[PDB]
Amino acid sequence: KAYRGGHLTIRLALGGCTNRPFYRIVAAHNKCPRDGRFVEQLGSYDPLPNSHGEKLVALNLDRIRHWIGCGAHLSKPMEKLLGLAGFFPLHPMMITNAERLRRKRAREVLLASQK
Amino acid sequence: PMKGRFPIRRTLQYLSQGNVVFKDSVKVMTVNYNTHGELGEGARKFVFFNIPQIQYKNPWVQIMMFKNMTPSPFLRFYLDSGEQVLVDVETKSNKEIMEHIRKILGKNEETLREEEEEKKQLSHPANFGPRKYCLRECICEVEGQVPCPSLVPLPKEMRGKYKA
Amino acid sequence: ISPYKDEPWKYLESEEYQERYGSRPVWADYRRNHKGGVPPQRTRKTCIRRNKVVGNPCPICRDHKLHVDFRNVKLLEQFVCAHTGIIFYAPYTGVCVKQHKRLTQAIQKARDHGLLIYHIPQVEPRDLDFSTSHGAVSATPPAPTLVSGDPWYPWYNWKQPPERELSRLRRLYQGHLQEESGPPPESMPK
Amino acid sequence: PYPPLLRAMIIAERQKNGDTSTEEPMLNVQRIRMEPWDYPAKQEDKGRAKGT
Amino acid sequence: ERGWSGNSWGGISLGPPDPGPCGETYEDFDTRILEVRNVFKSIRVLVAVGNGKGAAGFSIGKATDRMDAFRKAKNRAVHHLHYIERYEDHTIFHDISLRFKRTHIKMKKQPKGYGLRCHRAIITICRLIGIKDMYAKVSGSINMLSLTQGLFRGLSRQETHQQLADKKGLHVVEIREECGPLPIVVASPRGPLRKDPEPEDEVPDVKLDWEDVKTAQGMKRSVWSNLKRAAT
Amino acid sequence: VRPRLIAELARRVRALREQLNRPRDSQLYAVDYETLTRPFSGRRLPVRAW
Amino acid sequence: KKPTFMDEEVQSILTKMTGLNLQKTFKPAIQELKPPTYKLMTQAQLEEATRQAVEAAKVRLKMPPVLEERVPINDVLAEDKILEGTETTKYVFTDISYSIPHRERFIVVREPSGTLRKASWEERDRMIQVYFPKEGRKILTPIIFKEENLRTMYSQDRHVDVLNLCFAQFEPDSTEYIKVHHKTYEDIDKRGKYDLLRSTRYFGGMVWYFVNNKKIDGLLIDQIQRDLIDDATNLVQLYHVLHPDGQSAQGAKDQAAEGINLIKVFAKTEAQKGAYIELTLQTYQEALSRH
Amino acid sequence: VRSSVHARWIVGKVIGTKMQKTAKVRVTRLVLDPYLLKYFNKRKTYFAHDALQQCTVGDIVLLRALPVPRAKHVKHELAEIVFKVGKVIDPVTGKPCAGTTYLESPLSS
Amino acid sequence: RKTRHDPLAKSKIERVNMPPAVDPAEFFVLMERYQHYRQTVRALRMEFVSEVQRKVHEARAGVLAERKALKDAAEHR
RNA sequence: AUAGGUUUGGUCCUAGCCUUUCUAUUAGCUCUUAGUAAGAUUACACAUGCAAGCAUCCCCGUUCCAGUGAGUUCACCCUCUAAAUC
Ligand code: FES
Ligand SMILES: [K+]
Ligand SMILES: [K+]
Ligand SMILES: [Mg+2]
Ligand SMILES: [Mg+2]
Ligand SMILES: [Mg+2]
Ligand SMILES: [Mg+2]
Ligand SMILES: [Mg+2]
Ligand SMILES: [Mg+2]
Ligand SMILES: [Zn+2]
């Protein structure tokens, strides 16, 4: 199928069931449906903690590197995941949101002290 | 019962029992053989029993037969480079002919094993998807992970209906 | 009310059981009533509905002294092929679907507790090489930033902008300004 | 510096291949010239609104 | 207990055969009705008897009264017994393909626990003979008398492993997948053993059945095959 | 394959009519300073530009 | 140096001590059955088939390597304090590139505190089972390995089944593997069930454990009672090479003890029940003279 | 990479020579019947450029793909004549033959 | 979704998208953080691209592949 | 198909029809709770409301997603080679 423009992008395809999400890390054309045709499955991500309290993330680092070197883009959630894995620098918004949460809880603690 | 002499020839097991997988150079195989004459007996057997297997393992190689055109039977292979390989098969048994062509133009076991290992890499066991391609469909099939809501209702705190 | 509920296996060593069944399986004499020569491919869902037994109860439901318990090994053995180690499907013995599910769970629990003998294969090792010298399982040399206690990259930390740049931003966003944020708390507030 | 995990993988591969040098792996960024976002773009490549 | 159906005589037991005039008792033999027919009136009954240990037979009885026909068939059956060889006393020694008149019967030896997946009359006769594991397919006309005659003929004309060894003068070696490459010698020649090996037939000229090949290749699609059924 | 000539005809006619009725910069980038909209399209300009 | 378990001489001694019973090695399995096949064979063909079966059994009896308990993995890759408190559960990142050995594959954990550390051994094995499932292994440890169920399995004389389950479930150098194997060996020694492991691949490991813990008296007694005198002498020689500075080995060198005399020297020097060893050896010699 | 024609080398029998410098050649391949699992001949016609018009009806010829088709139906050229109709030279011995009989004895040389 | 031929809803004709308020210090710090992060990510992308090209060059016109090709040709001869 | 019923005064053979099995839709009668999956008959006609914005103006997007199954060997492989991403 020929799309006008577009590019390959490594992103998260949502599967699972209602109230039980699960993600597949796939390299696919940006114009394709979210859960539709893909070029290669590059990993997976279970956002629900398991019986060990762990969120499991599988990354095909070799193929991820190959597709990045082949010109594939990255969705923001995948960039944040790779930053958490240590594969990239921490995304600026992770740091900014951490600081925002710090300030919010500082305000709440000051409210508690004031009361 | 199944029609014809030696009906076993028309079973997928027999057809897949062949051990000759040609190198990519081979494009055409001509089989010149004679219908009568004891010295050509093996060649006739080679046509009767082994050509189906050779074709089954090599679908894209053009095999063509010729009958009583020369005083003796022989095989000729035409390669992509333009080279031609002539194999005289008079006085040879069909098994001998099969072994000879395997030796001179057949991929060795090592190349076949490498190709099989290459085929293995495409089916990554860790991938999730439909059963036609993947071992498992969902991470919920993994023990210790949160199970499917179809089989085990999720706790009410984890359901949007009771979070809204 | 069965006296064998706490110790079900005793029932299979009692003379009453021997008189009733002898040496044959408890399902030997059962026969499903159905139309046609080919039976339905599933047994009934259950023989007991609201504490009432149906006319032709299955082998397990027709005898109340037979308890499907993972300790009742000798009973569970009668529902597994002794030559192949496979649990019979419900139409084979005629046990209802509910009791078949209970029997399957009991057999699995007995096998898990080592009470029921089953064929355990001899498998090959996972890894060809058992070396643990690779960095993935060994220790990686710490990076200088980790040693010094600094963040991995300098920009992970807050740097207060110069006053001039903040003034440009305030000029650029006249009338659409929020309160300036100071440096964040160093540690996560508790 | 490389990211933590990537640095660890590079060092692990080096140690596997016999290299024992203690130099840190580093990413060269001299060739990465950060143009400001407000730098003028190429107007020759830009499109034009269509008549409607 | 009912037979093959509620209103059917077939499969019903007639009890042990009567003590014969020869002075022998047959308390160990069980009798089963295979067919009851009205002859135009009299009754013609086909019954089979067997002791569960290889000795089995069958007979026809004709009489105006049904009970007299049963008694005649049973007493005549006990005096026309076959002996059926059994491999390890549970199955037949080899696959048997036979045609009696217009009835074709294909029987296959099966491992232990396979059960009797056979025509119901074949199941009854096999229970009488003592065969416990076998597959059977009946084709052509399903005529009860021809079926019984063909079954007894084929089962009586099976070559045991000892017979094969004595004929070929060679060790009969069994290969079981469950037992790995261990060769199990099931029969050895009573006389001397030939020192020359059998010809290594590269392709045997056997007559294959298209149904078996289709089943092996997965091209059989019947909705009626391999259906769940009660123990037999 | 039954040729679709009308498609080519329409494509050529549209290309010609687009190259001969090109809107000029005076039409494209005019602005109504009271409402800050483009009269050519009617689209309002972003707030930060006003 | 001291011979390793995989030393050629040690491997040969343990292979000969194990024995090869084709009936026990290829005992009929309880699995899906198919109709058997038949072949007409001459005596030479039968002997060739038996020889091939012997080679297959030799492949089947290949002793697993004996490995030392692995050192715990405690390595930190990064400490990103900025991420402290931004998450409530840990992230486990497994590299699933296909053509990587599982002991060289990077598996890391980002903790809620912001620490990026390497995965522990148990987490590594769990992840490898999650993404590269292996037949016979489970992600959650089976309950059969609890002490009560292991006791039941021992009572049923199913030690080989226990060892097969352990091999399938645990890695050779893991703590659980070593603990279960040691319990199995201890029970075998306590109840004189060494014959259960003969003609199996676990006999060599059991013998190695007994020799290294200096508890070969029961195995010597069993071998003497079973008239496997060559095995007893080979066991004594193995004990002496693994403990060449022991009084038993020095006694053997001083008295120049060979054959049964080696057993006598061991019984007199460094046997916990040398008296019973001497009694059994004397009975064996008397029975041999009578025969 | 060397040609856009699918069939690179093929062997066939010349069935027509009525076109100028073009031989119509019949090529037979073996195709498995999915139901009977037997191999049957499937025939296809090819036009081969014969610049010298040296092909005769009935001879067995080798066709080599052109780098690009020179006409609508001409995608090949005549590489050689494997067997000249009625003028076969035994490849094994190199001597003329008429069917299964040698026209010239191999011993003569 | 709508196509370019579908008309705009009549309840949105008077809609004005008011830009969000800006925190100056956070804005400046975030701009710097994005700049540094994108520079690092382009460096990493360059390394990955070079790796891909080098693998392709090692596969075609390599050295071990060249040995393999020569060995296979000599075997054929 | 492990097969069964039905032609004749009767037997055997051939042969059709039907029975038994498993799904999907609709209809009758009857239906309590929870989780999950699926969900016009009609390429017939459509009231009404929404489904495409973003952005310091240019551009970019609205060519995607979503829908239907009317027509129907434009889908797959190779050669060559535009547009697009790096
Ligand atoms: S199939 Fe996994 S959540 Fe439903
Ligand atoms: K825009
Ligand atoms: K349609
Ligand atoms: Mg009835
Ligand atoms: Mg009929
Ligand atoms: Mg929709
Ligand atoms: Mg679409
Ligand atoms: Mg239509
Ligand atoms: Mg281009
Ligand atoms: Zn029941």
Numbering used by the authors:
A (entry chain M): 10 to 124
B (entry chain T): 2 to 165
C (entry chain O): 48 to 237
D (entry chain 0): 165 to 216
E (entry chain D): 190 to 229, 239 to 430
F (entry chain 0): 6 to 55
G (entry chain R): 66 to 356
H (entry chain N): 4 to 112
Give the exact sentences the study uses for this entry:
Mitochondrial ribosomes (mitoribosomes) synthesize proteins encoded within the mitochondrial genome that are assembled into oxidative phosphorylation complexes. Biogenesis of the mitoribosome requires trans-acting assembly factors that chaperone rRNA folding and guide mito r-protein incorporation.
Upon the departure of MCAT in state E, h42 can become ordered in the position previously occupied by MCAT and h31 can adopt a compact conformation forming contacts with h34, h42 and h43. Thus, dissociation of MCAT triggers global compaction of the 3′ major domain. Although we did not observe a bound methyl donor in the enzyme, we did observe methylated target residues in states following dissociation of TFB1M (states D and E). Maturation events downstream of state E subsequently link RBFA and late-stage assembly factor METTL15 function during mitoribosome assembly with mtIF3-mediated translation initiation.
